[PDB]
């Protein structure tokens, strides 16, 4: 099985330079083209450019000024460099194999037939910070809802579990939103029997690795 | 460019899904379909209009040439509820179409609504976040509005929506209203007002600071 794996640092500030590498395993680089694609949150994939076995490149004209793709056949790798990044370069970046070939007289086919796993790139002026975790306490007024507000962290992601992961039923952990401040925030909620609020303990466990932050918050009426 | 329609298909596990992709200018049989499951990379599904990619289930087929292409899923399985993209050659600016999302259809379910005041912990830090939860509803379209001492708010809230729930195929939505402690202390009643197909009329949840 041919396998592609993206590598490289993903956290940049504006004006800086993105530098990623794709390593190809389980197959040769000859007779395919080699592409970088990215996908911003909630958008379709965008083809960035490709390189051919011979070394010739082709780039998306909207990146032409700032992009370079290279390849090292001896090392079974190819690479992306994107200069002068902005917040708009924020996205999941994928390396991908392109099956190419002749179709008509002066026509071709082009299919991205093997994708790598993706690497999350964030471009932001914000600085790394671990979250504050506040209770969303069950209302004093059958079924009750409660939760944790996980606020003011950067970059993504955090993880949230309830009672060490033992409580999963009725749990919803929302997608993060980016605040005007440049920090992220999200909430995690659970619904439970009103009857339990006296006897049952509910604790949200929050983890943010970019800051080595790990917090347990007991949520009480 | 490529035009996919419709944007969303709402179908039951078992039914036939039919997805359209129209290219503005002809591309021969050289169009591909890709499938993307949430938090996973896209994968090749069909290439050259009709060729199953290596490994792709026989329930997936493709037709058309030139201008009009169709992806058919003979009988949907749980794992096929996903986003599907088309792509032909290396057309720019947009090499991929906008995608069609195939969602699980279910019976209408109204949101259950909860409002949460800011915690004393957060207030200590000088900020108040007020959270409104719309839980377990279908279909996804829902409207939420904040009112503070009866005045309609705008611009000081942010919302987020889950993906369809794996067991009950519903959605849930949070809306968070944020303001300074000082701002929070100058009003009494915080309310969120929720509208949805499943609510005969709008539902309001509120508290008094």
């Amino acid at each position: 099985e041919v396998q592609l794996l993206e590598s490289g640092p993903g956290l940049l500030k504006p004006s800086e330079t993105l530098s990623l590498t794709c390593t190809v395993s389980g197959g040769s680089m000859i007779n395919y083209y080699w592409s970088w694609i990215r996908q911003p949150p909630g958008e379709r994939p965008q083809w960035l450019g490709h390189i051919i076995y011979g070394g010739t490149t082709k780039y998306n004209p909207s990146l032409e000024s700032r992009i370079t793709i290279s390849r090292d056949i001896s090392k079974n790798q190819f690479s992306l460099r994107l200069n002068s990044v902005t917040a708009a370069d924020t996205a999941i970046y994928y390396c991908a194999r392109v099956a190419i070939g002749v179709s008509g007289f002066l026509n071709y086919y082009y299919y991205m037939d093997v994708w790598g796993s993706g690497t999350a790139v964030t471009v932001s002026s914000a600085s790394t910070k671990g979250p504050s975790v506040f209770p969303l306490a069950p209302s004093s007024k059958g079924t009750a809802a409660l939760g944790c507000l996980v606020k003011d962290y950067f970059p993504e992601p955090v993880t949230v579990s309830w009672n060490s992961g033992a409580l999963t039923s009725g749990v919803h952990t929302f997608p993060a939103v980016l605040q005007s401040s440049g920090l992220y925030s999200l909430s995690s909620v659970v619904t439970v029997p009103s009857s339990s609020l006296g006897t049952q303990t509910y604790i949200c466990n929050v983890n943010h690795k970019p800051s080595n932050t790990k917090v347990d918050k007991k949520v009480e009426p | 460019e490529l035009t996919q329609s419709p944007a969303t298909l709402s179908l039951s596990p078992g039914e036939r899904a039919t997805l359209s992709c129209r290219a503005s200018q002809s591309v021969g049989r050289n169009l591909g379909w890709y499938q993307q499951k949430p938090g996973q990379a896209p994968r090749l599904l069909i290439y050259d209009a009709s060729n199953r990619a290596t490994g792709i289930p026989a329930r997936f087929s493709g037709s058309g040439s030139g201008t009009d292409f169709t992806l058919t899923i003979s009988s949907l399985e749980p794992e096929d509820f996903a986003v599907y993209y088309c792509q032909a050659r290396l057309l720019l600016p947009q090499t991929f179409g906008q995608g069609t999302k195939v969602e699980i259809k279910r019976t209408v379910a109204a949101p259950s609504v909860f409002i949460f005041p800011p915690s004393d912990e957060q207030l200590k830090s000088g900020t108040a976040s007020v959270v409104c939860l719309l839980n377990n509803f279908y279909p996804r379209e829902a409207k939420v509005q904040w009112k503070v001492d009866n005045a309609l708010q705008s611009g000081n809230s942010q919302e987020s929506v889950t993906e369809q729930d794996s067991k009950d195929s519903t959605y849930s939505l949070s809306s968070t209203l944020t303001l300074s402690k000082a701002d929070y202390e100058k009003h009494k009643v915080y309310a969120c007002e929720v509208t949805h197909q499943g609510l005969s009329s709008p539902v309001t949840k509120s508290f008094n600071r």
Binding site: N31, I52, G54, T56, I100, G101, L106, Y108, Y110 | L90
Partner: peptide, 9 residues
């Protein structure tokens, strides 16, 4: 395709 870009005109 290996030495000259098949996606040029």
């Amino acid at each position: 395709w290996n030495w000259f870009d098949i996606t040029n005109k």
